[PDB]
Amino acid sequence: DCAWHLGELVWCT
Amino acid sequence: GPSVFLFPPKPKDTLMISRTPEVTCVVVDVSHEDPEVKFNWYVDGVEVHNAKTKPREEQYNSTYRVVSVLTVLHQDWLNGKEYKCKVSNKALPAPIEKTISKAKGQPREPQVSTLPPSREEMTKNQVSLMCLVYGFYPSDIAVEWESNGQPENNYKTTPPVLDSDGSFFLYSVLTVDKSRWQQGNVFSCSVMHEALHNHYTQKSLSL
Amino acid sequence: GPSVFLFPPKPKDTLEASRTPEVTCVVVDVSHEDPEVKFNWYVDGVEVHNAKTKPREEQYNSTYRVVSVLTVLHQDWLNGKEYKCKVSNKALPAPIEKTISKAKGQPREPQVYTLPPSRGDMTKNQVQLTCLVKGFYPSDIAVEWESNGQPENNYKTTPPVLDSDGSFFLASKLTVDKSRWQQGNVFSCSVMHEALHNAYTQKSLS
Ligand SMILES: *[C@@H]1O[C@H](CO[C@@H]2O[C@@H](C)[C@@H](O)[C@@H](O)[C@@H]2O)[C@@H](O[C@@H]2O[C@H](CO)[C@@H](O[C@@H]3O[C@H](CO[C@H]4O[C@H](CO)[C@@H](O)[C@H](O)[C@@H]4O[C@@H]4O[C@H](CO)[C@@H](O[C@@H]5O[C@H](CO)[C@H](O)[C@H](O)[C@H]5O)[C@H](O)[C@H]4NC(C)=O)[C@@H](O)[C@H](O[C@H]4O[C@H](CO)[C@@H](O)[C@H](O)[C@@H]4O)[C@@H]3O)[C@H](O)[C@H]2NC(C)=O)[C@H](O)[C@H]1NC(C)=O
Ligand SMILES: *[C@@H]1O[C@H](CO[C@@H]2O[C@@H](C)[C@@H](O)[C@@H](O)[C@@H]2O)[C@@H](O[C@@H]2O[C@H](CO)[C@@H](O[C@@H]3O[C@H](CO[C@H]4O[C@H](CO)[C@@H](O)[C@H](O)[C@@H]4O[C@@H]4O[C@H](CO)[C@@H](O[C@@H]5O[C@H](CO)[C@H](O)[C@H](O)[C@H]5O)[C@H](O)[C@H]4NC(C)=O)[C@@H](O)[C@H](O[C@H]4O[C@H](CO)[C@@H](O)[C@H](O)[C@@H]4O)[C@@H]3O)[C@H](O)[C@H]2NC(C)=O)[C@H](O)[C@H]1NC(C)=O
Numbered sequence A: 001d002c003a004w005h006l007g008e009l010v011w012c013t
Numbered sequence B: 001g002p003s004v005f006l007f008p009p010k011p012k013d014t015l016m017i018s019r020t021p022e023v024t025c026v027v028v029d030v031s032h033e034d035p036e037v038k039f040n041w042y043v044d045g046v047e048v049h050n051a052k053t054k055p056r057e058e059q060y061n062s063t064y065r066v067v068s069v070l071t072v073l074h075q076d077w078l079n080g081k082e083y084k085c086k087v088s089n090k091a092l093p094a095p096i097e098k099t100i101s102k103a104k105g106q107p108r109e110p111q112v113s114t115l116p117p118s119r120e121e122m123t124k125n126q127v128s129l130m131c132l133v134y135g136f137y138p139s140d141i142a143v144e145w146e147s148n149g150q151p152e153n154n155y156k157t158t159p160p161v162l163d164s165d166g167s168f169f170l171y172s173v174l175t176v177d178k179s180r181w182q183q184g185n186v187f188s189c190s191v192m193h194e195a196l197h198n199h200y201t202q203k204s205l206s207l
Numbered sequence C: 001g002p003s004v005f006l007f008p009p010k011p012k013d014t015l016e017a018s019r020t021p022e023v024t025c026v027v028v029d030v031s032h033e034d035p036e037v038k039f040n041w042y043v044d045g046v047e048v049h050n051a052k053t054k055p056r057e058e059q060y061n062s063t064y065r066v067v068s069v070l071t072v073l074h075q076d077w078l079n080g081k082e083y084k085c086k087v088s089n090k091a092l093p094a095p096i097e098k099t100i101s102k103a104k105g106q107p108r109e110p111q112v113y114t115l116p117p118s119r120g121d122m123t124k125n126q127v128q129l130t131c132l133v134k135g136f137y138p139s140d141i142a143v144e145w146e147s148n149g150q151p152e153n154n155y156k157t158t159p160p161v162l163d164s165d166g167s168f169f170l171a172s173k174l175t176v177d178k179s180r181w182q183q184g185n186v187f188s189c190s191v192m193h194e195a196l197h198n199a200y201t202q203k204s205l206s
Helices: B011-015 B074-078 B178-182 C011-015 C074-078 C178-182
Strands: A002-004 A009-012 B003-007 B022-031 B038-043 B046-048 B063-071 B083-088 B096-100 B111-115 B126-136 B142-147 B150-152 B155-157 B168-177 B187-192 B201-205 C003-007 C022-030 C038-043 C046-048 C064-071 C083-088 C096-100 C111-115 C126-136 C142-147 C155-157 C168-177 C187-192 C200-205
Touching: B003 B083, B003 B096, B011 B074, B011 B142, B011 B187, B022 B083, B038 B063, B063 B083, B111 B187, B111 B201, B126 B142, B126 B178, B126 B187, B126 C126, B126 C168, B142 B155, B142 B168, B168 B178, B168 B187, B168 C126, B168 C168, C003 C083, C003 C096, C011 C074, C011 C142, C011 C187, C022 C083, C038 C064, C064 C083, C111 C187, C111 C200, C126 C142, C126 C178, C126 C187, C142 C155, C142 C168, C168 C178, C168 C187
Parallel strands: none
Antiparallel strands: A002 A009, B003 B022, B022 B063, B038 B046, B038 B083, B083 B096, B111 B126, B126 B168, B142 B150, B142 B187, B155 B168, B187 B201, C003 C022, C022 C064, C038 C046, C038 C083, C083 C096, C111 C126, C126 C168, C142 C187, C155 C168, C187 C200
16 A cells, blocks of 8 residues: 555555 | 865655765865866766856855765665765875765665654643654655645654664654544645655654 | 853753853863953943853873853843853963853743654564654753653653744653553653743653
């Protein structure tokens, strides 16, 4: 899965 | 002669894959008589050739500021590769070499806890929301606030403090108009750190 | 030649009647060939005479560290009096003057609040207790924890952070064993600050 912050990509694993 | 300062990249730049982190080699006190600066970059003792020199900047105190910038890979930085900037200039008896990397140590996962305002603070026009972030290592972190998708800019975050277990902690305080809290609006604390799943977590808070 | 550093008193010493507050004039890089140093002190311009010189200390880099200490009255310091140390050594063209005083501006009362640990952080051996101190000026302060008359040592305090209203805030975090908190034990956050009633307040949680 992936993490987002204010509609911007943080990271995925 | 000149002096050298080597700066890491911003935690946000290293923790977000959609950002571009860089290490920055600033050389100050460069004379008008010898402005030329030779830069050599090394990553774990291995020379790289993709650095770029910023535009020369006049400082109006007899000297130049000369800056070389090196793009780095997220994983390289986070894996703890050491970056070395070597600086040569005619006014120098011997080249100056600096080195930086992420702080050494087994990374640790921040615990994020939200804290509602004190009942005794409800006398003022504005209330304080707290985000306690403890037990993280290294100290490189990012903390922000949001509500309804939009970012909340009215906050202050302490610098990380070394705790007794050799991990760091900090508090972030978001100040809001009391009415907004009274009305049941949800506020979120966003934390970014290398030891979180996907370098990101979020906790929420409402009455 | 020699350098001069002038230090304030500790906040605790200015805020407690029993304690003795002092301003300290530290002169480093004093030469073996001229260790003689004339100190002249001035309190808001007026020269004072009750300063004492500390014992001379050799530093191992073949320079002396000479220190002069001035006792100050609590009120005086808290009333914003300026203290000047004039240092005069023969290795100097002109004397070195330094001045310090409390920070300028209307003092403002700290707001002290206790905050219990998070419910989602209860499956741990230890719980984190929070003392938020906000709305204070100047930044000079002291914060401590106690329980049943005894002082608790397992805490950490952030340094003061300037707020957008021009006052400071901080947080103190006490770490205790979960069982202790569980047993209904009472812990207290003690705050010392010039603008508090009797320069002291206390809030408790259980
Ligand atoms: C002529 O003047 C120049 C310029 O000085 C300016 O102009 C003068 C006239 C005055 O107005 C000054 O107020 C101005 O600064 C003089 O150059 C100065 O020399 C100083 C040393 O002699 C040097 O001090 C050292 O600073 C380090 C930290 O510097 C930071 O922070 C200051 C502000 O606090 C800032 O002004 C600096 O530029 C520098 O800023 C950082 O820049 C980096 C890289 O660009 C940023 O990182 C990047 O950020 C971008 C996004 O923007 C991106 O994310 C990149 O990926 C990332 O890398 C970073 O964000 C900036 N930080 C901040 C906070 O803004 C200290 O580390 C260092 O301390 C260490 O060394 C000391 C001993 O030397 C020790 O005491 C200490 O323990 C430490 O070990 C020094 O204090 C100044 O930085 C420098 N100023 C500039 C602008 O370069 C020059 O000396 C003078 N000549 C003469 C003959 O007088
Ligand atoms: C020969 O060696 C000497 C000795 O140095 C020591 O030995 C060497 C080998 C190393 O191991 C050093 O680490 C050792 O210190 C050299 O002398 C040093 O020179 C430095 C600069 O030239 C100078 O730095 C300045 O320090 C200021 C802060 O100093 C504090 O904190 C530091 C670090 O904790 C500590 O080392 C200092 O001693 C000093 O500690 C305070 O002492 C005061 C005075 O007693 C205390 O206040 C009183 O305490 C009593 C208790 O007895 C009582 O509570 C009273 O109420 C109270 O008044 C205070 O509590 C102590 N604080 C702490 C934390 O313990 C900085 O402010 C200053 O920065 C400023 O200057 C610069 C330009 O302006 C800027 O960087 C900056 O912005 C500031 O403006 C300096 O950095 C060192 O202090 C000094 N060492 C000592 C011991 O004094 C010497 O340089 C060398 N010779 C040569 C030729 O180089």
